[PDB]
Nucleic acid binder design. Structure first.
Length: 49
DNA sequence: GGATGTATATATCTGACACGTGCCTGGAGACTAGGAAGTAATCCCCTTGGCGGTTAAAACGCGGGGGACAGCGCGTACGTGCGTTTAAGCGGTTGCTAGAGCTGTCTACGACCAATTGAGCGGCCTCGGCACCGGGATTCTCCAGGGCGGC
């Protein structure tokens, strides 16, 4: 069963895939968003925001 | 009526601005070579999120006593003040020598380049020593026969 993505999932996928440290850090002062293992973060974004 | 306090004017001292000059060091223009940026390939280490099992370290609680801290006494050693001494600080002599600066000459020593080759790095074969397996020598436990006692 292939399901489409929500808007939050789509913007998280676009922020990770086109790396946006400033945009990913924005919101409750970040917390040192680690973009090492890009595919791990993409799988996390595909699962749940 | 005489001398004192105060205001304005003039000469002199002093830091700062501009003018002048040398010179030498930085800037402009041109040329060239190589340092570094970029590209592709290969291979190994690091990242993130998990699982499993061992186990020794970490955590928690509790009793107790050793040590930190406060207080007090005391005596000594350091602060304080004064009078006396002494040596630092300044100015000075008198010559000679060391050293910075500048100029000049020259020569041995180090940069540079080409050819060479032999010392450093990797793998391969062998020995020294440690270990695995087979055989000989030495000592320990055991089963059976002979003799004696009882009904």
């Amino acid at each position: 069963l292939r399901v489409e993505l929500s808007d939050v999932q789509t913007e998280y996928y676009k922020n990770i895939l086109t790396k946006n440290y400033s945009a990913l850090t924005a919101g409750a002062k970040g917390g040192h968003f680690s973009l090492l293992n890009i595919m791990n973060e993409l799988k996390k974004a595909s699962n749940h925001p």
